[PDB]
Design an enzyme around this catalytic site. Sequence first.
Site, PDB file in Angstrom:
ATOM      1  N   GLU A   1      36.535  39.987  29.992  1.00 32.14           N
ATOM      2  CA  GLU A   1      37.740  40.498  30.635  1.00 32.14           C
ATOM      3  C   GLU A   1      38.879  39.540  30.339  1.00 32.14           C
ATOM      4  OE1 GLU A   1      38.478  39.302  34.642  1.00 32.14           O
ATOM      5  OE2 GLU A   1      39.528  41.174  35.124  1.00 32.14           O
TER       6      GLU A   1
ATOM      7  N   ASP B   1      33.684  37.770  33.733  1.00 29.42           N
ATOM      8  CA  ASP B   1      34.866  37.826  34.574  1.00 29.42           C
ATOM      9  C   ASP B   1      35.795  36.627  34.414  1.00 29.42           C
ATOM     10  OD1 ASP B   1      36.261  39.043  37.027  1.00 29.42           O
ATOM     11  OD2 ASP B   1      35.826  36.989  37.688  1.00 29.42           O
TER      12      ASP B   1
END
EC number: 2.4.1.7
Lengths: 504, 504
Positions: free
Chosen positions: A232, A192
């Site tokens: 990401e 993330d």
Amino acid sequence: MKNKVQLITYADRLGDGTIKSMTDILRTRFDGVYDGVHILPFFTPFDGADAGFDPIDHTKVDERLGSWDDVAELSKTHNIMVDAIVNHMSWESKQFQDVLAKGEESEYYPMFLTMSSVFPNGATEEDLAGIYRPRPGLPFTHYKFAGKTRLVWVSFTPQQVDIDTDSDKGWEYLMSIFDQMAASHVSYIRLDAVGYGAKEAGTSCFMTPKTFKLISRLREEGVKRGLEILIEVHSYYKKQVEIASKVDRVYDFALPPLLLHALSTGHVEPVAHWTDIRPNNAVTVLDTHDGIGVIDIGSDQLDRSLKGLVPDEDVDNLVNTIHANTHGESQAATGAAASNLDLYQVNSTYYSALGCNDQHYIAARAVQFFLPGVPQVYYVGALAGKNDMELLRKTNNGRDINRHYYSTAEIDENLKRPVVKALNALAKFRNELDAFDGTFSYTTDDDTSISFTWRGETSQATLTFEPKRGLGVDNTTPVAMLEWEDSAGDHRSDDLIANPPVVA
Amino acid sequence: MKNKVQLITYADRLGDGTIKSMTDILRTRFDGVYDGVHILPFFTPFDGADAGFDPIDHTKVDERLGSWDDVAELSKTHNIMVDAIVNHMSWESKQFQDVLAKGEESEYYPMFLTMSSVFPNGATEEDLAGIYRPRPGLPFTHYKFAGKTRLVWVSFTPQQVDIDTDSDKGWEYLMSIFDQMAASHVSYIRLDAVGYGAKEAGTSCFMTPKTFKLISRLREEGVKRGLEILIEVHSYYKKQVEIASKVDRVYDFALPPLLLHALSTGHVEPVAHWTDIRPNNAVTVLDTHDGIGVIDIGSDQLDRSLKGLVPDEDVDNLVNTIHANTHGESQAATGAAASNLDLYQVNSTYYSALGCNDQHYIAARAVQFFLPGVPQVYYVGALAGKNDMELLRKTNNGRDINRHYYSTAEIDENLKRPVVKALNALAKFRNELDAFDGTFSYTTDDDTSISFTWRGETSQATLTFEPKRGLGVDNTTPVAMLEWEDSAGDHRSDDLIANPPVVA
């Protein structure tokens, strides 16, 4: 990564509210449809400042959702993807709270980034103005360290304090997360906001060589533990292309808006071009748990001379088209119109962004499934959900428009809808026809249509996408046709909703 | 400044929506009640980013509200107070737009503050962390000056760009405002957010010696034009006490929360102490167009060892009591719960904060009117208005809970309420008895009651305030009694609602 469709879901927003319930839904309502699942942050807590992305204890399942044993049980039937929140943690974590109390005398003081940690000798306006930001405003907030006001580095909400990923305490923390996942039957790790993980005075602090070093180190730690990593990164498309060769997988964030563009205008050239240069070691999506990214195909924000996959004029039209299709709902939830961490992502469910056009939606899913990469379907999209204006009203969090809470009863009622049955059938087809595990090829009819073909061990399939066949939100004309050959003959569907494909 | 009660109001939220209508309402519904009026920002535009406080053209009345002719008309019957927004202006102003376009080549480049303007040689964390803030986060936002990203100083919304009050262009602009007011029959000037007007590297940039210099310079410009100035300063109480000797008037922001404290706990000692040390060249209020300020009586935010007018625990109890009395309404509009520029002011109408207790409300107004200073009544309070949850849910702007739009029809409906009739009568009394222009004195019965006395040329009046007589939001016992002498002899009211005072 298994080449089967995965579902992206919150454990509490799909079913009765627990990991057990979510697992039951997957097994009893989507058997053979979704063979894997990305469970959005289910650590302690899952309902804080950023819906799970501000963990107090990343290694502890929020007891209200279940336990690690529930994840183990789930792994018996589904491959599991979980987040590794490597850039920040909750300000309510024991570690940060210790710093607030003891300041520089805290053993965790070095674990967190402050303005001085990165700019020990001060910073010029240029230094601070040059830091990449997904929204206006500097990435700092006030916190008192043993009584002294300090500016803590915060990339997202003020409650998510950024950690120094190059500090001993920070690295130890990251490895504790990797160890937990490797011991809990997790197959894939989603890094993330990793693009923000490295800070350096004088740089954009976003996807720089220092960031690449962090990503490479995290990949190595993943390999050692038998974990594959997906990173990401919402950025100028070229950064995604460049980083892709250094990781197992990257998301294909260009496809979502490119398809909205194609379906609204009929132009497929941009899709053809992306197919030609895109990273193929990808995880494909239409919708995610966040808003629809548009800077992912536009010009570079730090340097506008670097154009995107389509002219900025087309991106602006795309955004206005979504606002038009949703009758202002997306306008009320996007950017400064509500609480958001990103100024440009358009907050709207993908189905609503298309004006709820079934033929356009199933076609978009078909194209997604036909491009190289492992496909993921966000739970709201799995149920062809519309914008949740009531939830948005209640929380004022822009992204909540695309985070509806689906009770078991609502799931069952939605499974009766032709478009939902069509998607379930399409995903099942994508999991069962072996052509997708073979060779990919495509041809394009000059900006009018594009045909994607897969040839496998005992089958082959060709998807022809021609948006100009049915422009308009009220369109009922199919814009995608599918021809395929399996062990039971040569088939063809000219309407994926009325004639969903089924593998022999 | 005339020692008569004034009304604080938006030109469009009291009546049909124009300065003309607002004037009509004042003259036909509040004759003899409100002899002066502070018209909140009615410049171009009045409905921007901060309800009038982000002017594109401070010298031009918003055409939708009326014209300077309407202001001239009003001045014939009422003395007018208007805002001089000296700290910032709209980013949509011609001046700022010129800077966005030409950058340093704009003649207005020096007019606006940027990080580099104040920190030419860069800033340390300490430099930036020390800047006073009414809410977390640095006072900077991104804007492109001729393509170059700059960090522009913004104390409030990012749309309100701070001007350099020390620059030639900045000063020319400020004087254009003063000139316009002097030429438009304005009597009083409110220096909005003047405490933020001076910036200097290494200082808090709030109410510092440099700020005093600016205040003094503005006062001189006011004097030269025959205009009296009222400065708005929400701060630790001692800052208000000290600056008061250098200006015509300061607001009494300590009284509002002190009275909520007194009415909820029965303790009047804090009010007695404040009466003893407070600046008497004040403009008194209960409610304003903003939230109820509490740091105005609490400990200093920089050095907590500098205690407030009441213990910190009592300030905390005061805040919780407001949230409790409004059953969550104020909690939904306060702080990070909604869009706000100040994290600690409590957003609630004063009447709702008191649990709608009429006796408490009229008593609070009586005390306000009996303390030295010119009294101002905010229009919502003038109509004993309750929290507007309908407006709050529509705009999500916290302060809107206290900014209801009153049509002429609704005004007349509210004028029939006993508590509203009582306030009108009390204000008239405060305007007609010459005792208030005489000598002031007070006595107190150790934390139980306080009696305020005024002795004038031909009259005298004594207000006895004793909250202990009727504590509780549900109590109906009067907590204030009034005794006075006029041309008709001695009089007494033991219930300001049932038996309002009328000067003979």
